[PDB]
Amino acid sequence: QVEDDIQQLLKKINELTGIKESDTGLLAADKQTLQSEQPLQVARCTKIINADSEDPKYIINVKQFAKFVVDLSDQVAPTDIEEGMRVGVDRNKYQIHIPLPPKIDPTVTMMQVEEKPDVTYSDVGGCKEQIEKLREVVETPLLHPERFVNLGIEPPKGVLLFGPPGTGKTLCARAVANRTDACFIRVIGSELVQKYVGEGARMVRELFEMARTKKACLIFFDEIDAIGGARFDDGAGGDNEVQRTMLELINQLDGFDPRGNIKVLMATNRPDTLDPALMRPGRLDRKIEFSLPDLEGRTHIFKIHARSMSVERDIRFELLARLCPNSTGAEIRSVCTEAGMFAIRARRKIATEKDFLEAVNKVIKSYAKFSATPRYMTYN
Amino acid sequence: TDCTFIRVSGSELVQKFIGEGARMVRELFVMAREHAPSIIFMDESEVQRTMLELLNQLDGFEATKNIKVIMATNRIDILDSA
Amino acid sequence: SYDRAITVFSPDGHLFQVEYAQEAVKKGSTAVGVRGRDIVVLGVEKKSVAKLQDERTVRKICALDDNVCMAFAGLTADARIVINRARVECQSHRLTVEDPVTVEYITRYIASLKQRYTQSNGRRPFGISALIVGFDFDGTPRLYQTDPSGTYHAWKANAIGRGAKSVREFLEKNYTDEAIETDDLTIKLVIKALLEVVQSGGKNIELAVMRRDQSLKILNPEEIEKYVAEIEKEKEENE
Amino acid sequence: RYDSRTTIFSPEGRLYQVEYAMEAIGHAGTCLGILANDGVLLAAERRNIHKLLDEVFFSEKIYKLNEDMACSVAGITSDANVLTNELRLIAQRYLLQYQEPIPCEQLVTALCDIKQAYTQFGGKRPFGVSLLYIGWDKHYGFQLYQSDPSGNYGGWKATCIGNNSAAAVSMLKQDYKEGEMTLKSALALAIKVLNKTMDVSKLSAEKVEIATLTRENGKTVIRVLKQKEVEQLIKKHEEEEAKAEREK
Amino acid sequence: VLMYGPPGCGKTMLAKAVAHHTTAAFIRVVGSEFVQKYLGEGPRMVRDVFRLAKENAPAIIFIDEIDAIATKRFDAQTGADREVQRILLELLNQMDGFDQNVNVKVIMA
Amino acid sequence: YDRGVNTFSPEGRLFQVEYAIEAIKLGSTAIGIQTSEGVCLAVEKRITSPLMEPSSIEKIVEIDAHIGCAMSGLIADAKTLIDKARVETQNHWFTYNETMTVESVTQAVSNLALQFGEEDSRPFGVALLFGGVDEKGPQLFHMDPSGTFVQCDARAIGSASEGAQSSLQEVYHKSMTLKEAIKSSLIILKQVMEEKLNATNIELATVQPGQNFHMFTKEELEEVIKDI
Amino acid sequence: LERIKDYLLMEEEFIRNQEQKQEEERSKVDDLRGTPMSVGTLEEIIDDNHAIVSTSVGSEHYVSILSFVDKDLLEPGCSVLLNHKVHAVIGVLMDDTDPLVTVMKVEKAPQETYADIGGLDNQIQEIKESVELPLTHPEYYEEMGIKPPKGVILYGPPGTGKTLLAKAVANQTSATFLRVVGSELIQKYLGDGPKLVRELFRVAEEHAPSIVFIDEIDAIGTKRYDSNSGGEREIQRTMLELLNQLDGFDSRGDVKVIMATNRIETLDPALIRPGRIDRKIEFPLPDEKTKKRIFQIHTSRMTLADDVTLDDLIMAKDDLSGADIKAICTEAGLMALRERRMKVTNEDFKKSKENVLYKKQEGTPEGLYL
Numbered sequence A: 001q002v003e004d005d006i007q008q009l010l011k012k013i014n015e016l017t018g019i020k021e022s023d024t025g026l027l028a029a030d031k032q033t034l035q036s037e038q039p040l041q042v043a044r045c046t047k048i049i050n051a052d053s054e055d056p057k058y059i060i061n062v063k064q065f066a067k068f069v070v071d072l073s074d075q076v077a078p079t080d081i082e083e084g085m086r087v088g089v090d091r092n093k094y095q096i097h098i099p100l101p102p103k104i105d106p107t108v109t110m111m112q113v114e115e116k117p118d119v120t121y122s123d124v125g126g127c128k129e130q131i132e133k134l135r136e137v138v139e140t141p142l143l144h145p146e147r148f149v150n151l152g153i154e155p156p157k158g159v160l161l162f163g164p165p166g167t168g169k170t171l172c173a174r175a176v177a178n179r180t181d182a183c184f185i186r187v188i189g190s191e192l193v194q195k196y197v198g199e200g201a202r203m204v205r206e207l208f209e210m211a212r213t214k215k216a217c218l219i220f221f222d223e224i225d226a227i228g229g230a231r232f233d234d235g236a237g238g239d240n241e242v243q244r245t246m247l248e249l250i251n252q253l254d255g256f257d258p259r260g261n262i263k264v265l266m267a268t269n270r271p272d273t274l275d276p277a278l279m280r281p282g283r284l285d286r287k288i289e290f291s292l293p294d295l296e297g298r299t300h301i302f303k304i305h306a307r308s309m310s311v312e313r314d315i316r317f318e319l320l321a322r323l324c325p326n327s328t329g330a331e332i333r334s335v336c337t338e339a340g341m342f343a344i345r346a347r348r349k350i351a352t353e354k355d356f357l358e359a360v361n362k363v364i365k366s367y368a369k370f371s372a373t374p375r376y377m378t379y380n
Numbered sequence B: 001t002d003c004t005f006i007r008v009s010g011s012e013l014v015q016k017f018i019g020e021g022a023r024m025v026r027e028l029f030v031m032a033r034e035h036a037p038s039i040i041f042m043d044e045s046e047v048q049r050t051m052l053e054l055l056n057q058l059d060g061f062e063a064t065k066n067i068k069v070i071m072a073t074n075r076i077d078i079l080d081s082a
Numbered sequence C: 001s002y003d004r005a006i007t008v009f010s011p012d013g014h015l016f017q018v019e020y021a022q023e024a025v026k027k028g029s030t031a032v033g034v035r036g037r038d039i040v041v042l043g044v045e046k047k048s049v050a051k052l053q054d055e056r057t058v059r060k061i062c063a064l065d066d067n068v069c070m071a072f073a074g075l076t077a078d079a080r081i082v083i084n085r086a087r088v089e090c091q092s093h094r095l096t097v098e099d100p101v102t103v104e105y106i107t108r109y110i111a112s113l114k115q116r117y118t119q120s121n122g123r124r125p126f127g128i129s130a131l132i133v134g135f136d137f138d139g140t141p142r143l144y145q146t147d148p149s150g151t152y153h154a155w156k157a158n159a160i161g162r163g164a165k166s167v168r169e170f171l172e173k174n175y176t177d178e179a180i181e182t183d184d185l186t187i188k189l190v191i192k193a194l195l196e197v198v199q200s201g202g203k204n205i206e207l208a209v210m211r212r213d214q215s216l217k218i219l220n221p222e223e224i225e226k227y228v229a230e231i232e233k234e235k236e237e238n239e
Numbered sequence D: 001r002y003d004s005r006t007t008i009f010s011p012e013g014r015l016y017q018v019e020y021a022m023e024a025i026g027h028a029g030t031c032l033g034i035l036a037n038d039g040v041l042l043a044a045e046r047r048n049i050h051k052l053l054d055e056v057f058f059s060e061k062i063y064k065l066n067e068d069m070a071c072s073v074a075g076i077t078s079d080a081n082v083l084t085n086e087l088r089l090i091a092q093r094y095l096l097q098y099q100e101p102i103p104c105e106q107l108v109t110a111l112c113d114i115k116q117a118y119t120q121f122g123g124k125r126p127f128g129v130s131l132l133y134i135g136w137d138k139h140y141g142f143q144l145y146q147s148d149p150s151g152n153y154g155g156w157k158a159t160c161i162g163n164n165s166a167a168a169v170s171m172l173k174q175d176y177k178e179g180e181m182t183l184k185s186a187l188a189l190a191i192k193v194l195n196k197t198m199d200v201s202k203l204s205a206e207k208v209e210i211a212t213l214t215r216e217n218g219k220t221v222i223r224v225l226k227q228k229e230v231e232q233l234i235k236k237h238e239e240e241e242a243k244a245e246r247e248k
Numbered sequence E: 001v002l003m004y005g006p007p008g009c010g011k012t013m014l015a016k017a018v019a020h021h022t023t024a025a026f027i028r029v030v031g032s033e034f035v036q037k038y039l040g041e042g043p044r045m046v047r048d049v050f051r052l053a054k055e056n057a058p059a060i061i062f063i064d065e066i067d068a069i070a071t072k073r074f075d076a077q078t079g080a081d082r083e084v085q086r087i088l089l090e091l092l093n094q095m096d097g098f099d100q101n102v103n104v105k106v107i108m109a
Numbered sequence F: 001y002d003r004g005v006n007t008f009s010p011e012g013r014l015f016q017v018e019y020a021i022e023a024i025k026l027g028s029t030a031i032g033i034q035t036s037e038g039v040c041l042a043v044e045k046r047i048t049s050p051l052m053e054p055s056s057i058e059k060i061v062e063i064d065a066h067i068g069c070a071m072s073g074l075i076a077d078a079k080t081l082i083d084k085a086r087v088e089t090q091n092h093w094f095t096y097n098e099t100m101t102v103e104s105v106t107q108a109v110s111n112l113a114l115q116f117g118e119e120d121s122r123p124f125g126v127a128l129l130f131g132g133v134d135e136k137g138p139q140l141f142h143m144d145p146s147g148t149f150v151q152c153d154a155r156a157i158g159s160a161s162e163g164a165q166s167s168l169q170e171v172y173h174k175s176m177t178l179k180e181a182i183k184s185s186l187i188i189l190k191q192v193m194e195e196k197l198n199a200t201n202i203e204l205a206t207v208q209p210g211q212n213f214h215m216f217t218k219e220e221l222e223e224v225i226k227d228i
Numbered sequence G: 001l002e003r004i005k006d007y008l009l010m011e012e013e014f015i016r017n018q019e020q021k022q023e024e025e026r027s028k029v030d031d032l033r034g035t036p037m038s039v040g041t042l043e044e045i046i047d048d049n050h051a052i053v054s055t056s057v058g059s060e061h062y063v064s065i066l067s068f069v070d071k072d073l074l075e076p077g078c079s080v081l082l083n084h085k086v087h088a089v090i091g092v093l094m095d096d097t098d099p100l101v102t103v104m105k106v107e108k109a110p111q112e113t114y115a116d117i118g119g120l121d122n123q124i125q126e127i128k129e130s131v132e133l134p135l136t137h138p139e140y141y142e143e144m145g146i147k148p149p150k151g152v153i154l155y156g157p158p159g160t161g162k163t164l165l166a167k168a169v170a171n172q173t174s175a176t177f178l179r180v181v182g183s184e185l186i187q188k189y190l191g192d193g194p195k196l197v198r199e200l201f202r203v204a205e206e207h208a209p210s211i212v213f214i215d216e217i218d219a220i221g222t223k224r225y226d227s228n229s230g231g232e233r234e235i236q237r238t239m240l241e242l243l244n245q246l247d248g249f250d251s252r253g254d255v256k257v258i259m260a261t262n263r264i265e266t267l268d269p270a271l272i273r274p275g276r277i278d279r280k281i282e283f284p285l286p287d288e289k290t291k292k293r294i295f296q297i298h299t300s301r302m303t304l305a306d307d308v309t310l311d312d313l314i315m316a317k318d319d320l321s322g323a324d325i326k327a328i329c330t331e332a333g334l335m336a337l338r339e340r341r342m343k344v345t346n347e348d349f350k351k352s353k354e355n356v357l358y359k360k361q362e363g364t365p366e367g368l369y370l
C-alpha cells in the first residue's frame, strides 16, 4: 500500500498543479489601407479560344463553365490577346483587362533539382567504362560539338540503365548532376500519375514546355515502372489511364520532331516490364547495365568507403574483397558502417581487420539466404 | 447479453471491384469504440492484405477490451498462416 | 538450376540436392562416438519406447566385422541397405585379402558407393551419415564419418543428428588430452556426452563400446544409472 | 511445388510418395494382431460386403504364405498379389537353399528391400501396401510384424493400420494385456476393438474375418476358422455387454 | 426444394408452370442475367429478396439457371477457388438466417 | 532456361561448363610454382575442428614417384580422377617399363574430363594442379573441368586466385630459386588466408630431379614458416 | 484504494486536455478577415499587393492582399485565406496538411520498456544500438565519422513480440513518433499512392528527428516481376513511390524506419537492400532459457501457489511462442477461477498447456526417419 501512497499523493499534487492554472486563469501596414482596396474586383482569369477578324470579339473558356464571348477593355495592348494566352476577364464589363502567364503548374517546376548534390566522379568507382560511355553521352556533345559534325554521326539522346538493386544508378545520376553545368531535372514518375482525366498527359505537356524554353537541359527519369511499360489489358478492364499518359509521353517524346538539345537518362530495376515503344533505338540508344566488380572494383569501393573513416594503417582489402563473393557498394558500405558499430561495441579509436571480418560475417554470412545454415564441408 | 452484438457474416466484397475497399473492421473498430461494450460475429483466409491489416488492428494493440470477435466456421486447415 | 534434379549446378555453383540430403541427417537422432586410447566408445540417444513393442530389431548400432562398428543417422532404410552391402563387401575383402579389414578400406568403399550412387541418373541419395569406428593396425583406434556427398573424414570425436553443434561443442569444451585413456575416463566421457545430450532423459540412453580386442558389449541401464549418479555427485562437488 | 516424381528430395528434406503412400494406407481395410503366447491371431475387415458375391475363396486378406506363416494385408489390392507371389517365392527359394523353414525376420527384410528398391529408383510407383505377419520360428516363438512402404519394419506386439485404427491402438494401449496368453481373452479383446472401430451395427459376422495360428505338437497349424464360433463369440461379447450394463 | 435431373424432363417447365398458376408475389429470377461483377451481388439479390418479399406480400422467388456464384470477372489469387467458394459460403450465410418466417420460397434447378 | 548439358546459348556456350568454372571458386586456395631447380607446391586446409585430424585431409596426393598433385573444389570428383590417374600411369609403366610424362598423364585425364554424357555422367567440378619431373626437367601443369589443359609457370587456383595471380606476377620471373619461391608462395598464402600461419594450416610439396622421392616437407615446414 | 487515484489521474488528464489578442487591433484583424474564411491555392504572386489564386472549383482572381503578419511568408503552393466578398487575401495560414496526419500519430507511450519482453538481448541489443544509441548518445558517429543505420526489418514466426518490440521502442524515446499500418492503400483511386507518402515524410521532416514506423506490409512485396497477363493495378506503383521516397534523392535527414513482417520471402527484394533498409532481425522460437523469463513476467503479479514448477511445462514440450505462454498463464487462471479458488495448482497448468497447444496438427510422420 506504499505504492498506493506514492501514486495517490503524486496524482493529488498533480491535481493541485492543474488547479494552479485553473485559478490563475484570471495596423498601419495592416488596418488603415483595407477599405481602400475593398473596391477592387474578383475578375477571372481565362484562356482564349480564337480571335475574330477586324475586331476582338473574343471567345474564351476559363476552366469549366462555358465558352465565353467577351470584349477587351480600352486600355489593352490589343495585339497580344491572341490564343493560348490566359487573360483577365471582368465580372461586370466582361472585357479583357490584363494578360496573365499560362498554366505554368509550379509543381512541375518543383521536380527540377534546383541544387547540386555532391557525389564526386571519384566516388562511383568500379564501372570506369560504363560511366565512360555515359560520359560520352553527357559531357562530350555538350562541350565539343565537333566530332559529331566532323564525322557525321548522331548523339545518343536517350540512355536506359538497368541492373540489380544496389548497383550505382542513383550514384551515376547524382554524379553527373554534381558536374553538370546544365539545367538538370529529376522526374518522379508519379508526378505524371494524378487523379483526374487527362492530366498526366498535360504533365508531359508541362515537361515539353519547360524543355523547349531553353538549351542543353537535362531530364532525368527514374523508376519508369511507376510510369509503366506494361500494356497489361484483357477482359478485366481496370487500370488503363496511366498507359494513356505514357503513350502521350511517347508521342511528344520521339517520332515526328523529337526533343533536340535534350539528353534523357532513365533507370529501371525491371527491364522485362518495359514497352517496346521505348526499347526502339532512336529513343533509347545505350542500354547500359552495370555489373558486380570482380576484386579491383570491390577493393576500390573499399578505398572510397574507408578513406574517410578511422581504420588501421595495416589492414588490406584483398582478403575482404575475397569474402565478398557477390556484393555491391551498398553492401560494402554496410560492411564499413557495421564494423564501425563493432568498434562502438569495443572502445576503439580506429577499425581493424577483424572488425571488418565480423562485419562481412554480419552482412553476407549473416544475410538471410535461406534456409539457412550451410554447415557442410564437401569443398575444403 | 444486452450488448452491442454485431454480425459481419458477409463476404470479402468491394475491395477494388465497384468501390474503395477497407472492408473487414476498418471503421468498424472505430464504432466498437463508439459503442464500447460490444461483441463481433463472423462466419469467417480468403484475400491477403485486408484481413492482415485488421488483425493488426485487433491484436492486442486495440483499446479497452471486452470487444470480442467470434469467428465460426468448419474445416480449420483452409486458412492462412497468421 | 532448381532443386530438380541432381545433375544441374546452381547459377552460383552449388548442387542443391547434396546440401538438401544432408538436412535429413541434420534432422535425425543423435549418436556420438569418441576414441579412447585402448577402448573405443559410441552410443545413440532416443530409444523412444512406445510402451507396446520390442526394440531389439530397431538397433542403430551393428557390426560388419569382428573389429568394426556402425552408427548412422537420417532415415533408417538407407542405413539398412548400406549395412547389407557393407557386410557383403567386408566379407569379399576377407575373401581375397586375408587381413582383418582396415577401417579406411570400408569407409572408402562406403563413400565411393555413395558417390557413384549420387552421380547416376535419378538414383535418390542415401540420406544417412555413418560413424565407422575401429582399431586394427596395432590396435590403433580410428573413427571416420561419412556424408551424403561421400566424404570420409577422420576425426577423434563426433556428434551427428539433431543439434549436433551443441554436442560437439561439449566435446570441444571437454575433450582433454589427459589422461589417457584410461577406460574410466572414456566411460565417464560417454557419461558426460550422454548427460550433454539434447534431452538426457536418463532412460533413453543406449551405448556400446569396444576395447579394440573384444567384441561389442551392450550395457545395462543400471551401470549407466550409477554413472549418472556419480556424474551428479561430481556436479555436486563443483558446489 | 516439389511434387513431380518419387525422387528427388524436398527442400527440408522430406518425402512426397512416402507420406502419400501412408495416406493411401489410411483408406483401406482394418487389421490387427494380438499379444498371445501359445498361439497368435489375426483380425480383418471385409470390404464390399454386398450381397452378390461368392465368398468361395475362404480368404480374401489372409495369405498362408509358407506353412507356418500367414499375412494380413491392407492397401491397393493387386500390388499385394504382386507382393505375395514374390514373398512365397522368396521363402520357398530359402527352403530350397537350406531345407529349413525361413526364420521370418530375414523374410521380412527381404520384402522390405524389395519395397525399398522402388523407393530409391526412378521413376516407379512405390508399393502402397502395408501388411502384417504372423509366424513361428525356432528362435523366438510367435511373432508379429508390420511392414511399411518406406521399407521400415517394426516388430510389434499390438499393431496399427491406418485412419480407422488409431483409436484401435489407443484401445490396445488403454486395454494393454500382459501375461494372459489365452486365445479366447484375446478374441474377446479383438471383438471389443472391432465393435468400437468398425461402424457395423452389432458386428455382423459376415463383415469380419478371423484367422489364428497355433503350435500343435510339431506342425504349427494355421486355423482360418469357420463362422459358427464367430457367431458365438459375438454372442459372448454381447453377453459381456450385458455384464457391462449391470452398472445401470 | 432442390430440383435437378436431365435437362428437359420438366424443371423449367414446372417452375414456369407454378409461375403460371401462382398465388403469392412470384418473382421470376434467372441466376446470372443481371449479375454485375459484384462478387457478392447475390447479397444484393437477397436484399431485394428480403425487403421486397416483405415490401410485397411474401414473395416466391425461383432462381433459374443456377450460375449466380460463378460470374465472369473472377479475379482473385487462385483460379476462383476462394472466389466460387466465397460466394458459395456467402449464399450459405444468407440462407441460414432468413427468419424461418420470411415467406420466400427459394428453388434451384 | 540454359537447363541442360545438351543446349548451347544464343551467344555461345555452356552454362553447364560455366557453372562448373563457377563451382571451382568455392574451394580452398593452392599455389604451385615451376622452378628449373624443381616444382614446389602449397595449399591451405581450412581446418574446422580441433577434432578434425589435419593429416587426414588430402590435398597433395601421390601419383608417381616423381609426379605430385593438388585438388580443388569438389572432393569426390577429385577422388575419382586421382584413382584413374594412378591406374593409368601404372598401365603406362606396365606396357612401357617407363614413366608416363606429366603432359601425357594429363592428356589421359582430360580424355574424360569431358566425356560427360548421361545418354548415348555430369561434368566434373574440380581443378587440378599437376607437378612432375619429366625428361624435360620439372613441369608444372594446370587443367580445368572443361579439359582445356595448359602449361602454367606459376598457377594459383580456387578462392582468391585473382590477387594470388596479381601479386604472383609481381614477384615471379624466370630465374627464381627454390627457397625464394617457397617463401614467395607462403607470403602470398598468409596474405590470402584469414588465420595465422602455423604448423597445421598449410602443407608443402616439393619435387626435385635429384630428390624425386618424397614430394613432401614434414615439420621442417615449421622451420620454414618461422623464417618469415 | 489506488483505483480512485488512477481514475482521478485519467480524469485530470482529460481536464488538462480541456485546458487547451487585441481589444481593437484584433477586431481590425476580424475585419482584415471576412469571417467565412476559405482555402485557396496561389499560382503566382505579382508582389504589388494583389495576387492570383486558385480555388477548389477553379476560379482564379486578382485579389488584394491584407497583411498583418509578413505577407511574404506564404508562397505559391501554400494556401491562403480568401473571403466571400471579394475573396480578399486575409493572411496567416500555418501550413496545414491532410486529416490523415494526426490519424497515424500516436500521442502516448502506453506500454513499457525492455523490461516487458523476456530475453532476446542480442538483437534487442541491436535495435538498442541502432535507435537508442544514435538518438541519446550520438557521440561516436561524429567522433568516428560513421553514419548510423536506418532500416530495421522484424520477421520470423509470428507472436514473438514484434508488436511488443514495437511498443517497447515506442516507450523509450524523446524523438517524435508515428504509427503507420502501411497496407492502408486499398482504394479505387488512381494516383493517391504518393499523396499519403509525400505528406507523411514532409510532416516527419518538419517536426523533429523521428521514427516513421511501417507495420506489416509483407503481403505488398509483390514479387517484382509483373502481374501475369493483364494485371497492373496500382500497388506496384505505390510501393515504387515509397521506394523512391526512401532511397532516391532529397537527403534522408534524421528519419528512422522500423519494419515488421511475419513471412519474409514473399517480400520485394528491391527494398531489402542495405542502405534502403539496413538491419534484419530474426525472431525465432526462442529457447528453454528465456521461456523461464516469459513465465516469470507472466507470473509477476498473479496468485500462484509456488509449489508448482513452470519448468516442468518447459521440460514437457519445447517449441511455442511467448504469446502461448501468456495464453496459458491466463487460461490456467480461469481454470482456477472455475470454483472461487485462491491460487493455481499444477493441473490447471496442465489442462491449459494442452488447451492452448491445439495449434500444430500434421501429419502423419516424421516421426519416421527414425
Ligand SMILES: Nc1ncnc2c1ncn2[C@@H]1O[C@H](COP(=O)(O)OP(=O)(O)OP(O)(O)=S)[C@@H](O)[C@H]1O
Binding pocket: A123, A124, A125, A126, A163, A164, A165, A166, A167, A168, A169, A170, A171, A268, A269, A301, A304, A328, A329, A330, A333, G247, G248, G270, G275
Ligand atoms: N561504386 C560504388 N561506390 C559507392 N557506393 C556505391 C557504389 N555502387 C553502388 N553503391 C551504392 O548504391 C547506391 C546507388 O545505387 P542504388 O541506390 O541502388 O540506385 P537505386 O535507385 O537504388 O536502384 P534501384 O534498383 O531502383 S533500388 C549508392 O547510394 C550506394 O549506397
